[PDB]
A paper describes a structure:
The human proteome comprises 266 human PDZ (PSD95/DLG1/ZO1) domains 16 and about 4000 putative PBMs, defining a network of one million potential interactions. PBMs are mostly (though not exclusively) C-terminal, with their COO- implicated in binding, and are classified based on position −2, being respectively Ser/Thr, hydrophobic or acidic in classes 1, 2, and 3 17,18. PDZ-PBM interactions are rather transient and promiscuous. Viral proteins bearing functional PBMs are found notably in HPV and HTLV oncoviruses as well as in HBV, WNV and coronaviruses including MERS or SARS-CoV213,15,23–26.
In another example, the profile and the logo of SYNJ2BP indicate that this PDZ-domain is highly promiscuous, with however a mild preference for E-T-x-V-COO- motifs and a moderate bias for basic residues at upstream (−4 and −5) positions. F HTLV Tax1 PBM sequence matches strongly with SYNJ2BP logo at p0, p-1, p-2, p-3, and p-4. Accordingly, Tax1 is the strongest SYNJ2BP binder in our interactome. In the structure of HTLV1 Tax1 PBM bound to SYNJ2BP, p-3 Glu of Tax1 engages contacts reminiscent of those of p-3 phospho-Ser of RPS6KA1, confirming SYNJ2BP’s preference for a negative p-3. In the SYNJ2BP-Tax1 complex, Glu at p-3 of Tax1 engages similar contacts as pSer of RPS6KA1_−3P, while Arg at p-4 provides additional contact to the α2 helix of SYNJ2BP. Yet Tax1 matches better than phosphorylated RPS6KA1 to SYNJ2BP’s logo thanks to a basic p-4 Arg and a p0 Val (Pro and Leu in RPS6KA1, respectively). Accordingly, in the crystal structures, p-4 Arg of Tax1 establishes favorable H-bonds with a Gln from the α2 helix of SYNJ2BP PDZ, and the Val-bound state of SYNJ2BP PDZ is more compact than its Leu-bound state, due to displacement of the carboxylate-binding GLGF loop likely driven by the larger side-chain of Leu. G Superposition of Tax1 and p-3 phosphorylated RPS6KA1 PBMs bound to SYNJ2BP.
Numbering used by the authors:
A (entry chain B): 348 to 353
B (entry chain A): 3 to 422
The structure:
Amino acid sequence: FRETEV
Amino acid sequence: SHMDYLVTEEEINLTRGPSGLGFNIVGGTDQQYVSNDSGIYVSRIKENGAAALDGRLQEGDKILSVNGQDLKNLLHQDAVDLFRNAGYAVSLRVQHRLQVQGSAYGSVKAYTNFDAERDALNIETAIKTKGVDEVTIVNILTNRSNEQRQDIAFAYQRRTKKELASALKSALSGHLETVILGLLKTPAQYDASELKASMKGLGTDEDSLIEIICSRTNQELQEINRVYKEMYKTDLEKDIISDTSGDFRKLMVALAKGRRAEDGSVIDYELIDQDARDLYDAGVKRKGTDVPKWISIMTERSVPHLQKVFDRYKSYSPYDMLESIRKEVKGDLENAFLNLVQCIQNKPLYFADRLYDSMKGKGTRDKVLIRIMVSRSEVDMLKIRSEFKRKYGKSLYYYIQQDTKGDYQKALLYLCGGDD
Ligand SMILES: [Ca+2]
Ligand SMILES: [Ca+2]
Ligand SMILES: [Ca+2]
Ligand SMILES: [Ca+2]
Ligand SMILES: [Ca+2]
Ligand SMILES: [Ca+2]
Ligand SMILES: [Ca+2]
């Protein structure tokens, strides 16, 4: 579960 | 009373700032957000950010493409890189998944992140914990819609080779068992089983038979009639005939047919007056009562029509419809007409009054309390609660809390859905 800010 | 998902696709154009586009993403072929989809999803929208101020992007949206490049079957990092290198003017194509509830006035809503297999596993775990973990069972089942419970039951049977209702029948007892088994039936199955229970054995539970038959609509009654025959291998009408007699039978049989006129767009003012005058001439105006006339008008006309009939009736009669019933008839027949007129005039207030009566005195009429909380939780419980608080001054939640205890209380309070 990687959550990446864009 | 069924839920729906509205899946729509939308193009959204944003301007990147120092803070970026203002949202987070999850997913990818190497980070599958669920078991199946490798899609890219919006997991969070930062406040006061680009996506937030634009207002179109939603948490839970799937990102289909960035500046024309599809995000299908990508590694997480390859999707991130499309965003990092998209420039300051970013064009997104997104897929919205909007959950639509079956009723706007229900207290129990469909659960958003629903996984039937996970719920079935967790319930099996709770059943097999030493002493039975009732808290988990209540937490899950009272916070899923009836349709979601049917999906849990299906997954449970496949996993365990046992029916979920039977497993919980064995694991539970007391009033809590009654609530949980009731929640597991479809609405028609539940009403059919409650009707059978009101008649099976010597005598009749007229109170319960009247409550169900007087309050259900044509659509609900048609499905009850069908399911009753499947479950019990006889017609509901034949059981009503077996358990009732006289004018009370005529009224119950007539209502149970579910052949009331449907609501129309044309108000029949001439018929409104004729019906009102006929009700007066059949009752208060004469010696005795022409009960067949009352039965025909009150079972055949649409509910909005009869609301106007009862108002016009007061132009002719010194007493309103409810007071006229009390003066004219008695016994089971009076009880039936009074319930029916209340259901026509204000059905949520009818149920609020029945709930108050089930708790107001010593102990609890648990059978009535449970049946209303189960059967109305996905129909009009929010209106019931509003009428209850207005009339009695404290919330339905408050009365349930004083009258019940334990996990049974917890379950009823979840079905209530909140305080007022
Ligand atoms: Ca226990
Ligand atoms: Ca049991
Ligand atoms: Ca009987
Ligand atoms: Ca009785
Ligand atoms: Ca009379
Ligand atoms: Ca009377
Ligand atoms: Ca009480």
